[PDB]
Amino acid sequence: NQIDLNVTCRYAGVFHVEKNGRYSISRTEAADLCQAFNSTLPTMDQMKLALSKGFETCRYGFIEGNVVIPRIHPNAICAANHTGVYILVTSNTSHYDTYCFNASAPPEEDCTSVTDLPNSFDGPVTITIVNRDGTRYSKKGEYRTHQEDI
Ligand SMILES: Cc1nc[nH]c1CN1CCc2ccccc2C1
């Protein structure tokens, strides 16, 4: 009974979270996940500031109201060579990654490891935070509040 959460550097408090390394987070689960990190889904303005500080990914993730990919460098296989905060317009499907925003993070780039899931609650799941440098933190708990997500 195990969940891996892959997390990125924070840029102006904004980071990317992927569950089990594949698109697998619903919009309701995304809200619960950010809450577990004492974070919220970012606004577009928050995401644009993160982009300006160096944030980019090659993965679709929820923000408040949209699914986006932040892009600095144009790449043919990431958001079809666009730069800026690329907004997903047309999709059949409902599961992506998420972005989260932590107001207590440093103002610019923070590439230190994430070491806790401070607001997870009591539960049976072994939840493992996995940093890009491979550093791991594990705890038993739960973050999902909606049954359709469990
Ligand atoms: C390349 C890729 N394919 C699916 N997801 C991804 C990006 N992931 C790859 C795995 C990973 C692990 C820890 C922190 C960040 C990431 C980013």
Swiss-Prot record:
Disulfide bonds join 9-111, 34-100, 58-78. Glycans are attached at residues 6, 38, 81, 92, 102. Residues 13-102 form the Link domain. N-glycosylated. Hyaluronan binds at residues 22, 59-60, 86. It comes from the Eukaryota. Expressed in the intestinal epithelium. It is found in: Cell membrane; Cell projection, Microvillus; Secreted. Interacts with PKN2. Interacts with TIAM1 and TIAM2. Interacts with HA, as well as other glycosaminoglycans, collagen, laminin, and fibronectin via its N-terminal segment. Interacts with UNC119. Interacts with PDPN (via extracellular domain); this interaction is required for PDPN-mediated directional migration and regulation of lamellipodia extension/stabilization during cell spreading and migration. Interacts with RDX, EZR and MSN (via FERM domain). Interacts with EGFR. Interacts with CD74; this complex is essential for the MIF-induced signaling cascade that results in B cell survival. The lectin-like LINK domain is responsible for hyaluronan binding. Cell-surface receptor that plays a role in cell-cell interactions, cell adhesion and migration, helping them to sense and respond to changes in the tissue microenvironment. Participates thereby in a wide variety of cellular functions including the activation, recirculation and homing of T-lymphocytes, hematopoiesis, inflammation and response to bacterial infection. This is CD44 antigen. It comes from Mus musculus. The lineage of its organism: Eukaryota, Metazoa, Chordata, Craniata, Vertebrata. The chain holds residues 23 to 171 of 778 of the full protein.
